[PDB]
Enzyme design. Structure first.
Site, PDB file in Angstrom:
ATOM      1  N   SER A 194     -35.128  23.957 -16.000  1.00  0.00           N
ATOM      2  CA  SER A 194     -34.638  24.493 -14.739  1.00  0.00           C
ATOM      3  C   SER A 194     -35.819  24.931 -13.887  1.00  0.00           C
ATOM      4  CB  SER A 194     -33.686  25.671 -14.973  1.00  0.00           C
ATOM      5  N   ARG A 195     -35.796  24.556 -12.607  1.00  0.00           N
ATOM      6  CA  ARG A 195     -36.875  24.917 -11.696  1.00  0.00           C
ATOM      7  C   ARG A 195     -36.741  26.335 -11.158  1.00  0.00           C
ATOM      8  N   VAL A 196     -35.569  26.956 -11.302  1.00  0.00           N
ATOM      9  CA  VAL A 196     -35.390  28.315 -10.803  1.00  0.00           C
ATOM     10  C   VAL A 196     -35.979  29.336 -11.770  1.00  0.00           C
TER      11      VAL A 196
END
Lengths: 145, 267, 116, 51, 43, 305, 116
Positions: free
Chosen positions: F170-172
């Site tokens: 996940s990039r968050v």
């Protein structure tokens, strides 16, 4: 809520393992049935059932009888089988410790305070401690048999 | 099954074939030096232990179970080296499962723990790397946790019957109480005042352990050469099949790329 | 598990997990051999070979090409035969006793005739 | 061990009477909830089919 | 093909996963012996 | 839900399951089967994004599901090839990457001056044999902020859902998660990488490493506890108690086959006895010093029946 | 060697030669094992693993994914730490002391805290 104390509450005999496992399984199944089910009666949507039925005065008569009272699988507290056996178990198992465990504690304290103490007077006190130790040795072999 | 996946599988299979071919050539040079140690140990086993054959030394009744000693190695990649040694010791332990086992390797102790873990009383690691000598066999015989208080003492090892295959043999070892109770033990002039019965069993334990370790190392090195030759031959067949699939995928990639440029330029 | 039951769902997941472990380790069994595996990998490779041949039953229309009779195993008989072989009750039998057969009844009869 | 058996037998004796009362109370609540849900589901199924 | 410098770990198949697990198992055993010897010889 | 490219029986079965669980009253269904024209299936992504954008611009949250992204790319190339146009790569149009990037860029979280709404995009990519290096697979993975890789090897063994921890990311980061789940499972991402390397050592014959026995046993119980059944979602209060007992070593003494029954027994005992600990993790969304000491004492006493 | 100096050129060539030699030795360990390595091959495998983890430093913008603070090493501190590890001054340290660290000062502090 004794968790670890209920598994070792019995004696040296393993005959109480079947009775302890059946009592713990019945208490967990009764608590899980009350939590999974709803804690209310019923909705009974009579506002959308009386105007949608084909027969006149069909859903109105069934809603008034279902909201009154009906029979259910229940019982009373007349058959108190576990309540009558609770007084007899405490009078034979719990009451036996008031005379057996109490006599062993008084005899062990009198023998330890007499065997640890000068010559002729100390030998007389050690004689009573030796008799108590001999009786405790025979009681220890009878407790395991 | 693309061009990048076929190139990585063909390059990795080519490196395994070169390592398997180099290991087989190195095993042949090590087999020549190990043949001199195995032939010298066979002549010492027929001269030093020649007194037991003329005196008829044998065991009788069991005295507090027995004692087993499985001699093997600690490394793998030798074919059915550890499987044949564990199958021979498990068949003889059916009639006497109360006897102790002394594993002399990591490969023999791993297979014996899955069937009889309570029978393992001793474990020795680090003996399968270099060749066996008289110093390694004499140290394990003196620290075997009372090895002279048993009636029967077997030494499970692998005997190289040929120069390609082998078989798991066994050799019994008598104690000090069984060496003096032989039939023709009093035929030779032996000093009864000094250590004669106890010295014969202690010297025979180190000689039998050195002969079993020398024969087991030569059989494991010969079995490793056959497994390395089979792995190099199997890698060559897989590289030939992968080359035919890579050649067909390279021609199909050139035809699929040229058809996409010809379709867009004609519309 | 909501259509075939909890018993049929556990047998399908256990049979598919054993075949996936033997297929991923095919690069070491075809190059190094079957002796390079451990103790847990050796038992899973033998059970995966017998489970793959037991699922291949001879059809009734292919009797002229195979020579054997047609076998039609039921849904309840196929779930009980796969669960008993994965638990260790048929580990002593051979791999050819389950090839081209039916359920658990045909596997025990084929092993006794081949050993006589 | 004998002194610990007195408190264990006194606690197990009182728990036997509470376990029997808990099973009867849970069965009465489950029977009343199932009977009320059956009357509501039967009236809703008849109203949905008639509509 | 050519250029086989590290082609085993670059594939990511059966031989690539076994090479990374063998190197991580040997490094984990050596780190326990180095950490225990440094704690006893800190003074 | 924007069902594009699916059959007629697949769209009717998904809408019937949501209505029986009280979930179809606040969900938009975009019917776009493959039996219609090519212009209807290609414009299904743009029509579904316009309906969900009305709630994000007013002060509500939306969640779009473009199922699937592979079916929308085949529908756009069919209408462009019949209009006398030149193709590109893999017999597709020239603006193949711009069609999927423009529809996914509109689903973003607005600021406080725009209403405070947001739109979540869930695009499913249908692969062919796990080949993620294709033309339509690599274009959608480099435009979205993370991807969930669904391998077919772990899905057949029973580990549902087959989510690879070493491939999906996940990039968050931890900013898009709750504070209660991030405290009890702060090392969940590092325990998945350490347990994968230690699991392959058991098939080599090594039985040593006494210090690695605790990490190998805790890794097998954590993977089975996180695998849930179909249509069985858990809240933040029930997932924070299950992740704390598997990461602290409290589930290492239990069996592997009893991992399914231990999840239902721990959630039922926390709702009738210590109900104050479950309500505090859902309302506040975090755990302080008083919440961490009460959760550790209740999990240790519940392990002995 | 004419832009970074003669000292920086020898450190860059020595680190590239040790990393390239570890790729060829790793392929033999997957088929033969660690028994084929000698004394020089065993020390080169341990030095290559510690040099690869020492070059990875925690960035300041990636603090939400790593958790640790960001570290910034200078050009003079990076050349002095790589030359001392290649000579044999940090051979007794573990591989976890150099992973996610800064220069030579952060590697010595991480080894003493992990042993307590």
């Amino acid at each position: 809520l004794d968790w670890t104390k209920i598994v070792s509450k019995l004696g040296l005999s393993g005959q109480t393992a079947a009775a302890l496992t059946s009592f713990k399984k019945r208490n967990d199944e009764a608590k899980r049935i009350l939590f999974e089910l709803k804690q209310q009666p019923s909705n009974v949507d009579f506002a959308f059932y009386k105007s949608t039925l084909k027969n006149t005065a069909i859903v109105d008569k069934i809603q008034s009888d279902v909201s009154k009272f009906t029979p259910s699988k229940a019982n009373l507290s007349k058959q108190l089988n576990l309540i009558e056996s609770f007084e007899a178990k405490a009078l034979e198992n719990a009451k036996e410790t008031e005379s057996v465990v109490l006599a062993e504690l008084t005899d062990l304290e009198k023998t330890l305070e007499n065997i640890e103490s000068x010559x002729x007077x100390x030998x007389x006190x050690x004689x009573x401690x030796x008799x108590x130790x001999x009786x405790x040795x025979x009681x220890x072999x009878x407790x395991x048999x | 099954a693309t061009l990048r996946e076929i190139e990585t599988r063909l390059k990795s299979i080519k490196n395994i074939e070169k390592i398997t071919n180099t290991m087989k050539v190195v095993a042949s040079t090590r087999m020549g030096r190990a043949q001199r140690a195995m032939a010298s140990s066979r002549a010492f086993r027929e001269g030093d232990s020649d007194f037991f054959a003329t005196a008829e030394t044998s065991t009788p009744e069991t005295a507090e179970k027995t004692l087993i000693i499985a001699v093997s190695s600690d490394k793998g990649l030798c074919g059915s080296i550890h499987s044949q040694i564990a199958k021979a010791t498990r068949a003889k332990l059916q009639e006497t499962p109360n006897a102790d086992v002394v594993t002399i390797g990591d490969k023999i102790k791993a297979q014996m723990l899955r069937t009889h873990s309570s029978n393992v009383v001793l474990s020795f690691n680090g003996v399968g790397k270099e060749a066996p000598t008289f110093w390694e066999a004499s140290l394990i015989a003196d620290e075997i946790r009372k090895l002279g208080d048993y009636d029967k003492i077997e030494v499970m090892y692998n005997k190289f019957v040929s120069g390609v295959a082998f078989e798991p043999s066994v050799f019994p070892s008598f104690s000090p109480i069984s060496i003096e109770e032989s039939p023709k033990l009093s035929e030779f002039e032996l000093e009864e005042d000094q250590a004669i019965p106890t010295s014969l069993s202690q010297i025979s334990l180190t000689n039998a352990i050195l002969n079993a370790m020398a024969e087991g190392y030569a059989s494991e090195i010969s079995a490793r050469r056959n497994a390395m030759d089979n792995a190099s031959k199997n890698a060559g067949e897989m590289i030939n099949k992968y080359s035919i699939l890579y050649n067909r995928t390279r021609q199909a990639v050139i035809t699929n790329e040229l058809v996409d440029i010809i379709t867009g330029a004609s519309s | 598990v909501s259509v075939v039951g909890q018993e049929h769902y556990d047998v399908a997941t256990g049979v598919q997990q054993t075949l996936q472990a033997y297929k991923s380790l095919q690069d070491i069994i075809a190059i190094l051999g079957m002796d390079e595996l451990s103790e847990q990998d050796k038992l899973t490779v033998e059970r995966a070979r017998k489970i793959q041949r037991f699922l291949s039953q001879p059809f009734a229309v292919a009797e002229v090409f195979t020579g054997i009779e047609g076998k039609l195993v039921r849904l309840k008989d196929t779930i009980a035969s796969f669960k008993a072989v994965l638990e260790g009750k048929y580990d002593h039998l051979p791999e050819n006793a389950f090839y081209m057969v039916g359920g658990i009844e045909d596997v025990v009869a084929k092993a006794e005739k081949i050993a006589a | 061990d004998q002194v610990s058996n007195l408190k264990d037998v006194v606690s197990t004796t009182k728990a036997l009477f509470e376990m029997s009362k808990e099973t009867a109370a849970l069965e009465a609540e489950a029977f009343e909830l199932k009977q009320k849900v059956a009357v509501a589901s039967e009236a809703k199924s008849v109203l949905d089919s008639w509509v | 093909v050519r250029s086989s410098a590290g082609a085993v770990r670059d594939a990511g198949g059966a031989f690539g996963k076994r090479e990374q697990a063998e190197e991580e198992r040997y490094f984990r055993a050596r780190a326990k012996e180095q950490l225990a010897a440094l704690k006893k010889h800190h003074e | 839900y924007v069902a594009v490219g699916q059959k007629r029986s697949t769209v009717a079965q998904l809408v019937q399951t949501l209505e029986q669980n009280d979930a179809m009253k606040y969900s938009i269904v975009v019917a776009a089967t493959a039996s219609e024209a090519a212009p209807l299936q290609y414009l299904a992504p743009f029509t579904a994004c316009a309906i969900a954008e009305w709630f994000r611009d007013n002060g509500k949250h939306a969640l779009i599901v473009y199922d699937d992204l592979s079916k929308q790319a085949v529908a756009y190339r069919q209408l462009s090839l019949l209009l006398r146009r030149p193709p590109g790569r893999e017999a597709y149009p020239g603006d193949v990457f711009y069609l999927h990037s423009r529809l996914l860029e509109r689903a973003a979280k607005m600021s406080d001056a725009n209403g405070g709404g947001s739109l979540t995009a869930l695009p499913v990519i249908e692969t062919q044999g796990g080949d993620v290096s294709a033309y339509i697979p690599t274009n959608v993975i480099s435009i979205t902020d993370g991807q969930i890789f669904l391998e077919a090897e772990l899905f057949y063994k029973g580990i549902r859902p087959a989510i690879n921890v070493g491939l999906s990311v996940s990039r968050v980061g931890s900013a898009a998660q709750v504070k209660a789940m991030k405290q009890v499972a702060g090392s969940l991402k590092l325990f998945l990488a350490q347990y994968r390397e230690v699991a392959a050592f058991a098939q080599f014959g090594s039985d040593l490493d006494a210090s690695t026995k605790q990490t190998l046993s805790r890794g097998e119980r954590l993977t089975q506890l996180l695998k849930q059944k179909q249509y069985s979602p858990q809240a933040s209060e029930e997932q924070v108690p299950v992740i704390y007992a598997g990461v602290n070593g409290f589930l290492d003494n239990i069996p592997i086959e009893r991992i399914p029954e231990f999840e239902e027994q721990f959630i039922a005992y926390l709702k009738a006895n210590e109900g104050d600990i479950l309500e505090a993790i859902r309302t506040k969304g975090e755990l302080s010093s008083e919440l961490l000491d009460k959760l550790k004492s209740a999990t240790e006493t519940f392990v002995a029946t």
